């Protein structure tokens, strides 16, 4: 069989081959192959296993991995990629001890980014986002989820969504778009938040017709949107055919997790303050818990989401950068992996499954990304490390040697 490409001399290969999301104990069952090969033809994986799996094939292009570690391209299931300006001028408020919510309550935070995003032209946001997405790619992310939510109005929310589609069609990273019009409350709506929510819901039909988003998200937090508003909002979104996601129980056990499970949301994200009942509902419903360790770290806190309890309870855990200018300005998914190990107390095996398979399922791409097996798009990363434990171990840097998307190297050294 004549094929396009073959990777040889792979020191360690992680296919992450699974039949579905990995919950509980299965997150620990990492299949490791040594001295492996990977065959690619017409942008797809034709084989990925131990040396000898290439018997019967002959490739034209041969890539020597020189004993390096090879894994599927990484999946970042939660980001706010498109945004205007930056929030460095808020560093001092945080340092002074002003809480994240108090900054928001005073017209800052998300609202500050909303003003800059509304003012930035669509072309500026595109170029701006292109730079950050290119960096994400250089760190190993070949598939990512991007949320709007910095417009809080028709014009800018649609603008963010169009930029996301544009990005998806003009660079390597495959993007999953999420509409998060219900991110915060414009000051002029503080007295009628339900009216604001209805105006955001009024956008679903055109967003749907334009295929501008596949999911709907919402910030269920004290002072922001309540559980009842979130239930009504999300149920409405589901009726329109949108998948469901939620920024839940970021500080306190508000019942955001319980709601997400009851609504059978694809994922519940953040969850630092979630209760045991919430954890049980997520596991029971199969709702993926996307943890954002960088956000906790960046907020200057030390109390992280209870990942071990979630895994002990059969929850499917994932990880993300939550890349956003306000609470987690980092594109480095590898650092997220390091923080998960050091502060979420997750093992290297669990972390790898979290940033590939589980991240993929968290955004409706379980059948398309996160695994290197026959038929899958040839998206992989060749690492500057001999083993998988080394990646989360050595922190704050970029271990990427080369990144392959659709069978072509898109990042070199
Ligand atoms: Zn977020």
UniProtKB/Swiss-Prot annotation:
Enzyme Commission number: 3.5.2.7
UniProt xrefs under CDD domains: Imidazolone-5PH
Single GO term (MF): imidazolonepropionase activity
Record text on cofactor binding: Binds 1 zinc or iron ion per subunit.
UniProt pathway: Amino-acid degradation; L-histidine degradation into L-glutamate; N-formimidoyl-L-glutamate from L-histidine: step 3/3
Cofactor: Zn(2+); Fe(3+)
Protein name: Imidazolonepropionase
Species classification: Bacteria, Bacillati, Bacillota, Bacilli, Bacillales
Keyword flag Heme: no
Catalytic activity: 4-imidazolone-5-propanoate + H2O = N-formimidoyl-L-glutamate
Enzyme class: hydrolase
Annotated Pfam families: Amidohydro_1
